[PDB]
C-alpha cells in the first residue's frame, strides 16, 4: 500500500487506466494508444455521445476506502528454462 | 410512456417507476432528444 505518494491534498488524477479496447490484451503485450472507442457504426473521432475516451483517469486522494487506496503492484517474471543464466543467489565456489 | 409524461413531479417528492419483466431496448435512449448530459458512473453508457 503507498498512499503517501500517490495521494495529496486537492487530490491528484495523474495516473490512467484504459477500459475500452477493441479487442482483449494479448499477454506481456502493450497497447498504448488514444483511440476512442467506436460505438454503433460511427467513425466518430471526439469525445461526448457515442464517442468515450479508451482510457479514464485513475484519480487518487489520501482519503478513500481501503479497496480504493493506492496500491503499488511490482510483477516479477521469470524464465527457468534449459539456458544460461544470469541471476543467483548465495554463492560457494567447491573445486570440481 | 415514462419519457414522455406531461407532468413530472417537483423534486420535494420525486415519483418513482419501478421497471420489471421487459426486453431493455436502448436504442430509444439514444435517439431521443439531442440531451444535455449523459455522464454514467457504474456501467459502461456502450456496453450496457
Ligand atoms: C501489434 O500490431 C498488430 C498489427 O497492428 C496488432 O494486431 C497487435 O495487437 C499489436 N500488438 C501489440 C503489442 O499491441
Ligand atoms: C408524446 O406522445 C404524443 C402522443 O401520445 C406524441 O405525439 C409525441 O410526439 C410524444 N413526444 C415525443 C417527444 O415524441
Ligand atoms: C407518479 O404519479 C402518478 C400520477 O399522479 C401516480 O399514480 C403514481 O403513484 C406516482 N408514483 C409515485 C408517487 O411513486
Known amino acids: 500500500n503507498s498512499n503517501k505518494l500517490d495521494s495529496k491534498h486537492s487530490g491528484n488524477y ?59 503492484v511490482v510483477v516479477l517474471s521469470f524464465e527457468l528454462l534449459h539456458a544460461p543464466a544470469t541471476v543467483c543467489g548465495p554463492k560457494k565456489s567447491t573445486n570440481l | 410512456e415514462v419519457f414522455n409524461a406531461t407532468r413530472f413531479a417537483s423534486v420535494y417528492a ?11 431496448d436502448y436504442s430509444v435512449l439514444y435517439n431521443f432528444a439531442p440531451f444535455f448530459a449523459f455522464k454514467c458512473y457504474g456501467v459502461s453508457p456502450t456496453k450496457l
Do not use: M
Open chain 1, 14 to 72: 495523474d495516473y490512467w487506466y484504459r477500459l475500452f479496447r477493441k479487442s482483449k490484451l494479448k499477454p506481456f503485450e502493450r497497447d498504448i494508444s488514444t483511440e476512442i472507442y467506436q460505438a454503433g457504426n460511427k467513425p466518430c473521432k471526439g469525445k461526448g455521445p457515442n464517442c468515450y475516451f479508451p482510457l479514464q483517469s485513475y484519480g487518487f486522494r489520501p482519503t478513500y476506502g481501503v479497496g480504493h487506496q493506492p496500491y503499488r
Open chain 2, 14 to 24: 420525486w415519483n418513482r417507476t419501478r421497471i420489471s419483466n421487459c426486453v431493455a
